[PDB]
UniProtKB/Swiss-Prot annotation, chain D:
The lineage of its organism: Eukaryota, Metazoa, Chordata, Craniata, Vertebrata. It comes from the Eukaryota. The modification Asymmetric dimethylarginine is found at R62, R63, R65. Component of the 40S small ribosomal subunit. Identified in a IGF2BP1-dependent mRNP granule complex containing untranslated mRNAs. Interacts with HNRPD. Interacts with PRMT1; the interaction methylates RPS3. Interacts with SUMO1; the interaction sumoylates RPS3. Interacts with UBC9. Interacts with CDK1; the interaction phosphorylates RPS3. Interacts with PRKCD; the interaction phosphorylates RPS3. Interacts with PKB/AKT; the interaction phosphorylates RPS3. This is Small ribosomal subunit protein uS3. Changing S4A: No effect on phosphorylation by CDK1. Greatly reduced phosphorylation by PRKCD. Abolishes phosphorylation by PRKCD. Component of the small ribosomal subunit. The ribosome is a large ribonucleoprotein complex responsible for the synthesis of proteins in the cell. Has endonuclease activity and plays a role in repair of damaged DNA. Cleaves phosphodiester bonds of DNAs containing altered bases with broad specificity and cleaves supercoiled DNA more efficiently than relaxed DNA. Displays high binding affinity for 7,8-dihydro-8-oxoguanine (8-oxoG), a common DNA lesion caused by reactive oxygen species (ROS). Has also been shown to bind with similar affinity to intact and damaged DNA.
Swiss-Prot record, chain E:
Monoubiquitinated at Lys-23 and Lys-29 by RNF25 in response to ribosome collisions (ribosome stalling): ubiquitination promotes subsequent activation of RNF14, leading to EEF1A1 ubiquitination and degradation and rescue of stalled ribosomes. Deubiquitination at Lys-29 by USP16 is required for maturation of the 40S ribosomal complex. It comes from the Eukaryota. There is a cross-link at K23, K29 (Glycyl lysine isopeptide (Lys-Gly) (interchain with G-Cter in ubiquitin)). This is Small ribosomal subunit protein eS31. A zinc finger (C4-type) spans 37-60. Part of the 40S ribosomal subunit. Part of the small subunit (SSU) processome, composed of more than 70 proteins and the RNA chaperone small nucleolar RNA (snoRNA) U3. The modification N6-acetyllysine is found at K20, K29. It is found in: Cytoplasm; Nucleus, Nucleolus. Component of the 40S subunit of the ribosome. Part of the small subunit (SSU) processome, first precursor of the small eukaryotic ribosomal subunit. During the assembly of the SSU processome in the nucleolus, many ribosome biogenesis factors, an RNA chaperone and ribosomal proteins associate with the nascent pre-rRNA and work in concert to generate RNA folding, modifications, rearrangements and cleavage as well as targeted degradation of pre-ribosomal RNA by the RNA exosome.
RNA sequence: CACCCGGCCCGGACACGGACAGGAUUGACAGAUUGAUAGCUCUUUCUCGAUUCCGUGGGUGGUGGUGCAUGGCCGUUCUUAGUUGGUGGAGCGAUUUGUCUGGUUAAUUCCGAUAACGAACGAGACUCUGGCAUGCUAACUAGUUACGCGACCGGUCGGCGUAACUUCUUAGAGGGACAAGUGGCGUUCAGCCACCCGAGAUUGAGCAAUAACAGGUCUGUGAUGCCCUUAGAUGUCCGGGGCUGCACGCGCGCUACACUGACUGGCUCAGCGUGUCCUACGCCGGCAGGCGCGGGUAACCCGUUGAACCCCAUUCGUGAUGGGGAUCGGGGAUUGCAAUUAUUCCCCAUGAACGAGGAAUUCCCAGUAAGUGCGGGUCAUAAGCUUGCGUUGAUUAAGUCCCUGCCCUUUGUA
């Protein structure tokens, strides 16, 4: 029951905000002590490569960005309740990692 | 024989590495463990998750 | 090519047991990872599957750098006759419905 | 030991891309439109969207559990953690890939362009 | 090319080679003409060679003077 | 790694014939041989067991040829405002009108004319990024304020532990700017210039049509048609050497020619972003580095990223000089199997041209030019390159079609 934390990590913002909000309101209605979403610095993966395969042109470059948005929600609740509240909330395009102490 | 076929060491160097797609060993993107040719990455960038913003 | 019978039967019995085969397209690879302890080079697996394909017993496909092989009804027939098993036994691809 | 979030999200990207490339070269003839992969620590499901599913399943669902045995043998996740599902495409007309594949296989039929 | 031609080594064809290994007498004395290889796996299964000035085993590559 | 010299290997599927357990074939100790401990080959025998080996058909390989056979991306025409059907009108017709006299716009952008009326793509809209919120939701992987305890003189603390919070920090939602308000000018129309209130009254990008280059790439590909070779190979591998070879001519660049500057010491500030290889701390060495023991798969550790120009002292003194550091001699370390034609790195010594560059010619309008460092990509070793990020921070212009080109409209053309 002690200090389970839940790390929600995704590339989409909307889906991550929706699922995390659902976990929070799902926990709040049960009268459980919850520490709110801790938004960490957004990880931006940059790749800059030549457009051309051959290498004859005006030396143009692509700029490929990949965004990683990470949220932490913390609970002071029993593991039995934590298991089912973590079980019910599934979404394609979010990764959830639960840790205790 | 057995001790001269693939005898030369390839722990390091450009010859040791190769593209995961086309097995080419030139203009290779080995950042974030992509391990892929620059031509092949540009083809597979979209469905990997890499997007062009600015 | 010239390879010992042990390697040949090991490749054939794996192919018959599972019903499919995967190779990594590299002639220098020391041992096939699924056939570890048996001491079967990847080269042997590729050429064995090539030899069985050329006749027309196994269907091959090629993705990025991997060979893929599916055992057909002619292959099932050929293997049962070559490996000498009773018709009762069928591959894992032909067990369920 | 576990890999970084950055490498993990990249790895999932390559998994998606390579799986797609394999599925295209396999099920091009049966108008493979697209794939959807949902991952659960219990078992990860792969959902194939194709024009004619009756064909991609095979004789009494034989070919589907060849494709299952392939991805299991190759990628190295444990057996009983994947079930390749084949769902019907809602409308085959509004899929560029399906229409492109159809045009290719009717051109291979020896018809005028 | 400067060299005339490089020819592959062809194995000299010998007829019924295992008859030189044994010398059976009329009453039955089965004497081994070539010496036995004293290594583990070879023991009783491999008859070590007898060259002009040395012994040699083709399997384990064991040599004696 | 294609190229040059020399040497192993089949990784020549499948089929037909011959061979063939009375053994098709495989591998090899020793000595010779070879650059090689390569059974490659020669002498000499051993060793494996229908997996092969010889002939024909037929394959399979290629960084082999052809980009003027091709596909895909990509560059350019072409960064400007261009582009096309339907039905109606005008010509026998190619074709034209719509798509425009005139205003107006960055814009075929709008207003308004109107044999055209309805449309479609491009432009705009759009998406990402900068600039504002003492309002909102939150936070021992971010901080402040207060209080307690401590160290040193009410003060300094990035010395430690609790309580109010979110100003600073991260980042979701939502607000905010629209020529909206005022005054001129504008067929009082589209709109233009100035000014108040404001964080802002033009931020920087990404995406980009129709129609074409005989543009580049077969040396990105298991994208590919023909052709060339295919077992003394253009396959593949192993040893070397070459890609760097220098009487000369061009093209991007870096360091300079000094005193607004070098040198020596002191002081004090970043941002982007990367680490299964990034590194703190302790010890030994002048230094490159050597050992030992820790943290970090990362707002957690490196790290409060104590960066450089710059700032403040010292020495130098117009001298090819303590400017400049090329070229050359010795040593001492780190990669790596291997460093010579010196891979990088450190120390002492050597001390060339160069005194601001002829004809000519490039780039650029504000956080811009330029100076100045730092991170990413290459990366075992690794930046004089490019791709990003901050830092200090200007002069001149708000115009023109003179040069070089571009768009529309008239004409002229052999
Ligand atoms: Zn590639
Ligand atoms: Zn022996």
């Amino acid at each position: 029951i002690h200090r389970i934390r839940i790390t929600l990590t995704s590339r989409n913002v909307k889906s991550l905000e929706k699922v995390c909000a659902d976990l929070i309101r799902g926990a709040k209605e049960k009268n459980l002590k919850v520490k709110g979403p801790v938004r960490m610095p957004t990880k931006t993966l940059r790749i800059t490569t030549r457009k051309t395969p051959c290498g004859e042109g005006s030396k143009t470059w692509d700029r490929f960005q990949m965004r990683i948005h990470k949220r932490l929600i913390d609970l002071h609740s029993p593991s039995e309740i934590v298991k089912q509240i973590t079980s019910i909330s599934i979404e394609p395009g979010v990764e959830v990692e639960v840790t205790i102490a | 024989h057995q001790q001269l076929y693939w005898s030369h060491p390839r722990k390091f160097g450009q010859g040791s590495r190769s593209c995961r797609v086309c097995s080419n060993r030139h203009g290779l993107i080995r950042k974030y463990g992509l391990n892929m040719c620059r031509q092949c990455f540009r083809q597979y960038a979209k469905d990997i998750g890499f997007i062009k913003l600015d | 090519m010239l390879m010992p019978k042990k390697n040949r039967i090991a490749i054939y019995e794996l192919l018959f047991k599972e019903g499919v085969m995967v190779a990594k397209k590299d002639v220098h690879m020391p041992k096939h990872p699924e056939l570890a302890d048996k001491n079967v080079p990847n080269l042997h697996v590729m050429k064995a599957m090539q030899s069985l394909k050329s006749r027309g017993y196994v269907k091959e496909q090629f993705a990025w750098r991997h060979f893929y092989w599916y055992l057909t009804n002619e292959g099932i027939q050929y293997l049962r006759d070559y490996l000498h098993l009773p018709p009762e036994i069928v591959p894992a691809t032909l067990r369920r419905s | 030991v576990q890999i970084s979030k950055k490498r993990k999200f990249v790895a999932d990207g390559i998994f998606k891309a390579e799986l797609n490339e394999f599925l295209t070269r396999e099920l091009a003839e049966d108008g493979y439109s697209g794939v959807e992969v949902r991952v659960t620590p219990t078992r990860t499901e792969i959902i194939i969207l194709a024009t004619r599913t009756q064909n991609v399943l095979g004789e009494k669902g034989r070919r589907i559990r060849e494709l299952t045995a392939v991805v299991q043998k190759r990628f190295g996740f444990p057996e009983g953690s994947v079930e390749l599902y084949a769902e019907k495409v809602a409308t085959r007309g509004l899929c560029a890939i399906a229409q492109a594949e159809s045009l290719r296989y009717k051109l291979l039929g020896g018809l005028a362009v | 090319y400067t060299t005339p031609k490089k020819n592959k080594h062809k194995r000299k064809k010998v007829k019924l080679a295992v008859l030189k290994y044994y010398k059976v007498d009329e009453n039955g004395k089965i004497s081994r003409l070539r010496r036995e290889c004293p290594s583990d796996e070879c023991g009783a299964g491999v008859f070590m060679a007898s060259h002009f000035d040395r012994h040699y085993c083709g399997k384990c590559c064991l040599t004696y003077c």
